[PDB]
């Protein structure tokens, strides 16, 4: 009867609308993701039950950059959590942002971005995660994830 979910970035386990919608999340039960009274459909969590939902997402920006010459290197990593209600356009719920180091000596960067919040969603609503610089995201099942659960 619980209503919650946490689905992770596939790709494998770690070593031992603006932006671009992330559609590679898992959609099946695993040892690190589940969907209880919610389901994934094209990278979007589909709500079944109306109510207040704490929604969250973590996205790992990990790059081993090289200072490119005739170009700017400043990076804006931003994670957007959108919703699709009975209205044509996607409505932004929250965004969290970072900027890489401006040091010409930067050799690489690791920027995990997490954010979460509660929003009232109606049945059939749909929520998803979007991001800039997706070619820099590390989708290991532990680095990046997405979930939501009922509250009240």
């Amino acid at each position: 009867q619980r209503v919650a979910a946490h689905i992770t970035g596939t790709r494998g386990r770690s070593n031992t609308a603006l932006g671009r919608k992330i559609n590679s999340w898992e959609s099946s039960r695993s040892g690190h993701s589940f969907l209880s009274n919610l389901h994934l459909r094209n990278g979007e969590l589909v709500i079944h039950e109306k109510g207040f939902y704490y929604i969250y997402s973590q996205t790992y920006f990990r790059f081993q950059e090289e200072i490119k010459e005739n170009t700017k290197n400043d990076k804006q990593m931003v994670q957007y959590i959108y919703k699709y209600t009975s209205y044509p356009d996607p409505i932004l719920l929250m965004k969290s942002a970072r900027n890489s180091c401006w040091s010409k000596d930067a050799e690489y960067g690791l920027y995990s971005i997490y954010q979460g919040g509660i929003f009232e969603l109606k049945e059939n609503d749909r929520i998803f995660v979007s991001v800039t610089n997706e070619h820099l995201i590390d989708m290991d099942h532990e680095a990046s994830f997405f979930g939501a659960f009922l509250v009240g």
Binding site: G19, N70, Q76, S86, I91, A97, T132
Partner: protein, 110 residues
Amino acid sequence: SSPSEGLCPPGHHISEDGRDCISCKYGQDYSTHWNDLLFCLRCTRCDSGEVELSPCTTTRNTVCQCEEGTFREEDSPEMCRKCRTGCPRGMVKVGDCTPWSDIECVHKES
């Protein structure tokens, strides 16, 4: 003024009783399609790095644009960046600075 199929026309939103459509407040909020929203969507207020090319209306958000000399592109829509003064050595300004693009260089052909 009247909900056509439990749906309201642009610029308006529906009431909780779903009986009456209500006008968004100009320069405040809007809605650019028919809908069932209990509240209209808030307008965007341009920041100090932006110019209000067009104001918020009851059926259209405000279009804020980067100031002259700054750009915002696909992987950086959060903060206006500055246009390069010149080009990397050996290229050619195949393009000039615009609100959605930085200058554009490429190499010497002939």
